[PDB]
Design a binder for this molecule. Structure first.
Ligand SMILES: *[C@@H]1O[C@H](CO)[C@@H](O)[C@H](O)[C@H]1NC(C)=O
Ligand SMILES: *[C@@H]1O[C@H](CO)[C@@H](O)[C@H](O)[C@H]1NC(C)=O
Ligand SMILES: *[C@@H]1O[C@H](CO)[C@@H](O)[C@H](O)[C@H]1NC(C)=O
Ligand SMILES: *[C@@H]1O[C@H](CO)[C@@H](O)[C@H](O)[C@H]1NC(C)=O
Ligand SMILES: *[C@@H]1O[C@H](CO)[C@@H](O)[C@H](O)[C@H]1NC(C)=O
Ligand SMILES: *[C@@H]1O[C@H](CO)[C@@H](O)[C@H](O)[C@H]1NC(C)=O
Lengths: 559, 559
């Protein structure tokens, strides 16, 4: 009988056998849950419990043992598992299934155990309905989701409160046995580790049975999630015996293709409106190949290896199912074809489109001029915007530690072409003063300002070098631009000057949102995921991509 | 009683239980082997067999079922497994261990089964002693190796005759349960897939128990090894029921540091002898910064990201244990510190040293000239030699599909800076004819030769584009050099000219050995591994590196 806690004593000569019978009517799935524990603190004689089905046999040893790194062992006493859910179809029949539960051990004196069995009342997840459940490293849980007729793709969202312990969320097709162990859950299907948040995007076309399992498994230790380790002189960590993690799981229906074309149209058209706006001004007004050839060879030749590398990354993550390889923003990531994140890709179109307009207007200026005012450097930074925009997008196909270096290498390429923290701050101080009645006052002001960041870098010591470099470059360039304004006023159009500040003010708002942070473990990078914010298709980092284009464009227009 | 085959019938009401008792004396390990089979062709009622130890329980179902890709099912009737080998120490005692074997099922009529049990006579592998054994997908195997006192590192080498089926060889520490299943063997320890050859290098410092298990597991399909699939209309592939693979395993003692230092000293001292010969010639005789700066900036800024990517690969392959990530030559791979292949790294010192000597002699020539003869292109090609050598070494830290593109990208960059198969052959023909009484005859000869290579490329269609490009370039350059020789002879030192041909012949000899080929599955790349050939520390590809270095040096000296 389910919902009852059996108690018994097992030893060498005596074993206990309990046969359970139950039925599962068609169109209803009934998963059995086994609840066992043992009070035997000894490990030389663990109690062995087996559950036998019509086709599958599952067995475990109690108290459960885990062998983490640095040869620490653990004694988990409460163990539990879910059996393979037999599925019934329109071929009707009250299937009078029976499940054998047998327990035995070889302890010379004995080992106490209490066994409880019960069907899971909430085993089939419902769409958009949040469910709450508690999982333990020795008590894994998994549930079945069935696709609806209209919906063709879903996003499964999991949120926890306390970051530790580490946990893994896996999605597999319905072919039992179900892989719900720490050493085996990673073999099949899609999965990702997590501490606080997770999100897996699925398509119905990849599941022939139009129903899939969702498996939750809690790790014994927390290295894989970037956690620490309490150094204890006792090999058997008896303190780590009641690990738990309150969990909430919600399955939302993925957006339809209607918003896909709406968001894409919005991106293209507004920059097309910039084309129309510039053309309207032109009609109203109507009423050096060495650098080009060298840079085009450098850009093309450098791009191809990273595209081959990244498309290789994209392919392997697509087939292996290891979703912790790429550091996406899994709450606001949208797939199309082979790309697993399309919003982060299309969002870089503005860089390509705005830069194209910059090259055309400079060409127009050059043509009119022909019919120290040089546009060669303008073309170099104009191409710089194009190449980075395409290259940054290809980085976002699968963001990682490896391909971030290639993201900023091209910026380092151009910077050179134009030409431990104490040392780093001191060198930055030297660069600030070497780069540049009242002339001395402003020079002291600029050096004092650059010294404030020097104290910031030396004390705070941020983990992102590129962000620190860009902030220094942004602050210094605006200072030079502000320098140009004040003396021009003192020397006796304007809208572009004002507009540059507004977008730059907007740009830095979304720059510091850090929704994805790859320097930590992939689980921690998923703590900072945030939902879609623009047209239900874009997130904050894409908004950073948009404003960074117009901020650079307006600043470049002043230049 | 071991070495006996029991026969029995199973059904709902009757189960069979057989208790075995045996002892394992100290310093001797005794692994039990279970050999089960069932004749029930039905899959709706498989017979479930469990083996219970003092601590561990292992259960399985017969006929074993596998679910490969494309939803093909496989039914194996012969199953087999090895139990946890209980270890005994100098704390003596004839441990009178017991092992229960319980077989049961719920088939309405029943199922036949035959069960045999036996201790493995050859369970502890001996050093340098080849062992032969047959493995099956449903009959995995594993054996224990114990390190000797003097030896501190070993290389385990596995050889098979027939390439298929695909197999996996793993090495784990002694902490049972032992991972000997297709879905679980990949979790812990080191492992690699293979068809014909495999080799794992192990150090004693990484195993606290100074003894490790080696597990052979045969895959159900051959997709992971690049195999094909017989498309059959029957879902239950009854033909795939007797898969077997003969195997030979041999553990060789890894070389000591003496040969390491001998080979390193040999290389360094022969190139220092080239230096000494150049200095002796000089003593006997005694009796443009824009290009440099641009090339050094480009080289450094392009090199740094690929070094970062390659060191990340090395770290992940070192920590994960996935040895199929890098396409080494595992028979002649030697570790030192964090590098898992040192010979392929040290072998590139010749490129750097020969390039350095070339730069020094060009500088000497320039200095003597100062006190259309331009050396700028000579400096550019010397820097190209340096950079290509360093980058080839960094690629050889871990060879892969991804980083070969970066390997060829620097050469492509240099070629550009100096400036579907039918279309490729036509374009190659056009390039050959565009690049270049008797002048017509020799031009026709060269065009016909390039047409012969065009036909080769169009018909054979090699999978390596870089090799084909390098061969074409080498042939054209040698043709140009021979042309210069003959027209200098007709116009009315030499040792270098003579030696260039010999070193190029040796270079091609060792280049066409293709010991590693990454375009296929890693198992196929391991099919072509060859043992160490020079000083017991170098293989054919390192000899290719050396001969390419000296051939390039001599050819450039001719130039
Ligand atoms: C469950 O099935 C077994 C045999 O299949 C039978 O003996 C038992 O009575 C069944 N349980 C119930 C409650 O009928
Ligand atoms: C064992 O589990 C049962 C239910 O699963 C519970 O009632 C009992 O308190 C547990 N025993 C211990 C010692 O935790
Ligand atoms: C037959 O299947 C359909 C859809 O699967 C279901 O709605 C219906 O209830 C089934 N019929 C019976 C008698 O259960
Ligand atoms: C093996 O052990 C069991 C109990 O531990 C005992 O009954 C049996 O006699 C032993 N076998 C032999 C051959 O003594
Ligand atoms: C089953 O295995 C035993 C030994 O393991 C062997 O003697 C017997 O021939 C096998 N039966 C079949 C049908 O293969
Ligand atoms: C004690 O251990 C050593 C080394 O492990 C072994 O050679 C020796 O035979 C052992 N003593 C006995 C009595 O087995």
């Amino acid at each position: 009988d389910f919902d009852h806690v059996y108690s018994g004593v097992v030893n060498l000569s005596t074993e206990n056998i309990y046969s359970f019978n139950y039925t599962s009517q068609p169109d209803q799935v009934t998963a059995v849950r086994v609840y066992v524990n043992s009070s035997s603190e000894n490990l030389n004689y663990p109690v062995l419990v087996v559950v036998r089905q019509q086709k599958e046999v599952l067995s475990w040893q109690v108290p459960l043992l885990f062998q983490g790194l640095y040869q620490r062992s653990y004694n988990y006493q409460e163990v539990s598992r879910t059996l393979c859910p037999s599925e019934a179809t329109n071929e009707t029949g009250p299937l009078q299934q029976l499940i054998f539960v047998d327990v035995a051990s070889m302890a010379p004196l004995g080992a106490q155990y209490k066994l409880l069995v019960t069907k899971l009342k909430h085993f089939q997840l419902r769409t958009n309905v949040a469910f709450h459940f508690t999982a333990s490293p020795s008590q894994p849980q998994y549930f079945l989701y069935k696709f609806p007729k209209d919906v063709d793709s879903v996003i499964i969202k999991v949120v926890s409160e306390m970051a530790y312990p580490c946990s893994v969320v896996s999605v597999q097709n319905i072919m039992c046995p179900v892989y719900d162990l720490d050493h085996n859950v990673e073999f099949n299907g899609v999965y990702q580790s997590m501490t606080k948040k997770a999100a897996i995007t699925l398509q119905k076309k990849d599941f022939p049975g139009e129903q899939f399992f969702v498996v939750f498994v809690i790790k014994p230790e927390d290295y894989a999630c970037g956690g620490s380790f309490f150094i204890q002189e006792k090999e058997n960590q008896t303190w780590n015996l009641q690990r738990k993690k309150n969990l909430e799981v919600t399955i939302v229906p993925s957006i339809k293709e209607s918003v896909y074309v709406k968001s894409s149209l919005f991106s293209v058209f507004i920059f097309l409106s910039f084309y129309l706006g510039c053309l309207l001004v032109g009609f109203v007004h109507y009423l050096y190949k060495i650098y080009f050839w060298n840079i085009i060879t450098i850009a093309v030749f450098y791009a191809l290896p990273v595209i081959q590398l990244v498309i290789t990354y994209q392919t392997v993550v697509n087939v292996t199912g290891n979703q912790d390889i790429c550091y996406y923003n899994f709450l606001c990531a949208h797939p199309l074809g082979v790309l697993s994140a399309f919003n982060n890709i299309l969002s870089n179109l503005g860089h390509v489109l705005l830069g194209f307009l910059f090259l055309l207007i400079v060409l127009r200026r050059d043509i009119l001029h022909r019919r120290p005012k040089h546009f060669g450097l303008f073309y170099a930074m104009g191409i710089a915007l194009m190449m980075e925009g395409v290259l940054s997008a290809c980085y976002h196909v699968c963001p990682n530690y490896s391909n971030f270096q290639f993201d900023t290498s091209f910026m380092y390429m151009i910077a050179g072409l134009c030409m431990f923290w104490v040392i780093f701050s001191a060198i930055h101080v030297l660069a600030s003063l070497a780069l540049s009645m009242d002339r001395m006052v402003l020079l002291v002001v600029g050096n004092l300002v650059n010294w404030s960041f020097a104290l910031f870098g030396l004390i705070y010591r941020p983990r992102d070098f590129a962000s620190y470099m860009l902030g220094i470059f942004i602050c210094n360039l605006l200072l030079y631009l502000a320098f140009y304004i004040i003396m021009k006023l003192r020397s006796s159009p304007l809208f572009c000057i004002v507009a540059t500040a507004v977008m730059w003010a907007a740009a830095l708002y979304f720059f510091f949102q850090n929704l994805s942070s790859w320097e930590g473990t992939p689980a921690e990078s998923r703590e900072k995921n945030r939902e879609c914010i623009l047209l239900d298709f874009f997130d904050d980092h894409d908004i950073w991509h948009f404003l960074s284009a117009t901020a650079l464009f307006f600043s470049f227009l002043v230049l």
